[PDB]
């Protein structure tokens, strides 16, 4: 939420400053390329924020799916039961076992609600929490998880690295927006007669943003290759959508 709020703040600041340029630009022939570069950096920031929001929405979708499976099948187990009277156990070798005895199909020679009490509810809540924790993308710094190929870092570690990179991107975008506001004030003061140092700072910040975007694209391609080579269909679909 901090990343998303910072992205939205930068977006509204850039939108307001561009609206101010469009209002009091007049003719301004020397600002056309600067506005084009600002729009390009805004598009890059928009792609960054779209990736961040896509990751956040995927995580929230998994969370809400777990919550729905907990409410419909655990909190409301006695209401609209799953009817799966067969209890199976899956092992690491792909073997399936039947848990306990096999009850008959309700056939007794004949010639209320199954609600959960205090301890059962507490245990099912604990199992729901453990199922939430056991996600591969949330299993941070664990020995059971496998690192991504050609990277040597786990998936949560690479996600934390991507978060740090997009936070640095947000910070350098805030710096670029401050430089742009200073250039805007200088243009309000004089008509393209000063602010050469501010223009140089803007150019250097744009180059830094471009280099950071290239590095982030390389890291994202590496993460995509990792998701494709992991084998999970969810990671495959996520990589395909990000690509």
């Amino acid at each position: 939420k901090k990343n998303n709020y910072f992205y939205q703040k930068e977006m509204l600041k850039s939108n307001d400053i561009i609206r101010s340029f469009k209002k009091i630009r007049g003719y301004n022939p020397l600002i056309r390329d600067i506005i084009n570069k600002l729009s390009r950096i805004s598009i890059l920031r928009t792609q960054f924020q779209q990736f961040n929001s896509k990751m956040e929405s995927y995580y929230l979708n998994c969370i809400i799916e777990e919550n729905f499976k907990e409410m419909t099948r655990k909190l409301q187990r006695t209401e609209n039961k799953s009817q799966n009277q067969f209890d199976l156990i899956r092992l690491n070798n792909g073997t399936i076992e039947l848990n306990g005895i096999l009850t008959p199909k309700a056939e007794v020679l004949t010639k209320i609600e199954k609600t959960l009490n205090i301890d059962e509810l507490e245990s099912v809540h604990n199992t729901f929490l453990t199922n939430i924790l056991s996600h591969k993308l949330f299993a941070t710094n664990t020995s059971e998880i496998s690192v991504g190929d050609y990277s040597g870092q786990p998936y949560p570690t690479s996600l934390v690295l991507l978060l740090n990179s997009v936070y640095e991107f947000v910070k350098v975008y805030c710096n670029l927006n401050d430089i742009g506001y200073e250039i805007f004030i200088k243009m309000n003061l004089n008509d393209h007669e000063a602010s050469n140092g501010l223009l140089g700072k803007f150019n250097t910040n744009l180059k830094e943003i471009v280099s950071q975007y290239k590095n982030f694209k390389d890291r994202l391609y590496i993460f995509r290759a990792d998701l494709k080579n992991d084998g999970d269909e969810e990671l495959f679909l996520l990589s395909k959508s990000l690509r």
Binding site: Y5, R19, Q47, S241
Partner: protein
């Protein structure tokens, strides 16, 4: 990031669309026509949120945060008589200026600039009546000259009155114009201000509207009321993401962030499956469609509300909102099928976006064939052809200067040369917009910053 949105009804078509939208919202939230909510005020547990659109004066009454502004008092009086107590009589602006003296944009701009004090005072009053604000939603109705002028004046006031608010506009474009020259002049003069100040703009071409109204309805005769009912349903569906707060999209700013890549590209194209809340909605349970078929219909050109003219259309931001019991596996299947069928730019790796909303617990439940509906919004450059028709009319008639005796009165320019220069500047700005669109359609748009840093 979620704020309230105030509705601005402008012109006859705009007022009709606003009335239809408010009636649809009342039907959805069980508010009714009398203004007093049909549901008892004791059931405060509401999954929706009428606060961004309905001001709650009393525990049972919810006045819509809307202002109607029109030069014809007859339609306003009819709307107020039909919706007894629903609308606010203080938010109705007529200025007692009589009927519009022609269909010129200059007349609307003049009637806006003259009574700018009253409308701005009403806007300030409506803003003071609330606390959290995000922006306005203007109904331009560019087909009418006076309505387009009033909308342009309202935009030119709001842009420098509230620069911290995001502005969205809805421009209804006709299919075949009677006075093609005057209507093209009005639409171009409105698009000038739309490119200048409007943050987001959604077009509505009447050709596809009439086509859908002839297809899904049984009566061959088409009426303007149920024609605007389609735009009303579209607006209600796109505002559902804020009325019934979802888990991903819950604010207009967050919705427009993934739809507006740059302030220059602020024109979208809508599409919707066969509706279910309209008059003739009985012929929907015989299609037997799923969410995948709904996505296919959304991506089909026959369900778009604007003239597609798809000649390898270049997409920039495609977004969809599905309301009903949606399946994630079916959504994934539809996405996999559409990513191999939708043309995507080689310079942008952004794909289509999917959002799932919630259905109203008080709306009439539909059978399992059409219980799930969908809306699609695509950033397509196909609107440049709709604008190219008008600019070609401008180029073929401007060589003589016809109908110049109508745009000279009212506006601040009474001479012919000033009006000619203004029309030439508007033609130049729409030409630059079309050039920017056709350049963004290419890969060099992103390469402009790659070739030089």
């Amino acid at each position: 990031m979620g704020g309230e949105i105030i509705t601005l009804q402008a012109g006859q078509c705009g007022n009709h669309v606003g009335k239809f939208l408010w009636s649809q919202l009342a039907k959805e939230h069980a508010i009714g026509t009398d203004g007093l909510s049909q549901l008892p005020d004791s059931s405060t547990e509401r999954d929706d949120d009428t606060k961004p659109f309905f001001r709650e004066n009393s525990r049972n009454k919810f006045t819509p945060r809307a202002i109607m502004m029109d030069s014809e008092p007859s339609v306003i009086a009819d709307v107020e008589n039909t919706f007894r107590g629903f609308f606010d009589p203080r938010n109705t602006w007529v200025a007692s200026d009589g009927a519009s003296a022609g269909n010129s944009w200059a007349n609307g701009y003049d009637i806006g600039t003259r009574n700018q004090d009253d409308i701005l005072n009403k806007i300030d009053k409506e803003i003071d009546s609330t606390d959290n604000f995000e922006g306005f939603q203007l109904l331009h109705s560019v087909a009418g000259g006076t309505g387009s002028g009033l909308g342009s004046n309202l935009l030119e006031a709001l842009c420098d009155r509230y620069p911290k608010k995001i502005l969205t506009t809805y421009s209804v474009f006709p299919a075949r114009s009677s006075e093609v020259v005057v209507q093209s002049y009005n639409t171009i003069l409105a698009l000038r201000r739309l490119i200048e100040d409007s943050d987001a703009t959604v077009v509505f071409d009447n050709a596809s509207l009439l086509n859908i109204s002839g297809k899904v309805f049984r009566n061959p005769n088409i009426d303007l009321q149920h024609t605007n009912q389609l735009i009303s349903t579209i607006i209600s569906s796109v505002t559902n993401s804020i009325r019934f707060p979802s888990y991903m999209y819950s604010s207009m700013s967050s919705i427009y962030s993934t739809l507006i890549p740059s302030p220059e590209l602020h024109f979208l194209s809508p599409s919707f499956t066969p509706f279910t809340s309209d008059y003739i909605h009985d012929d929907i349970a015989h299609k037997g469609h799923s969410s995948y078929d709904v996505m296919l219909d959304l991506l089909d050109p026959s369900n778009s509300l604007v003239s597609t003219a798809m000649n390898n259309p270049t997409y920039f931001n495609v977004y969809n909102t599905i309301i009903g019991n949606v399946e994630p596996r079916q959504i994934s299947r539809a996405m996999t099928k559409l990513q191999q069928r939708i043309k995507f730019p080689s310079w942008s790796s952004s794909a289509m976006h999917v959002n799932i909303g919630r259905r109203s617990p008080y709306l009439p439940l539909q059978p399992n064939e059409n219980e799930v509906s969908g809306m699609m919004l695509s950033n397509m450059s196909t609107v440049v052809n709709v604008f190219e028709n008008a600019c070609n009319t401008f180029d073929k008639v401007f060589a003589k200067g016809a109908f110049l005796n109508n745009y000279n009165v009212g506006d601040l320019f009474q001479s012919m040369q000033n009006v000619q220069d203004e029309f030439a500047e508007s033609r130049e700005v729409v030409q630059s917009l079309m050039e920017d669109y056709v350049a963004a359609e290419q890969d060099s748009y992103l390469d402009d910053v790659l070739v030089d840093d």
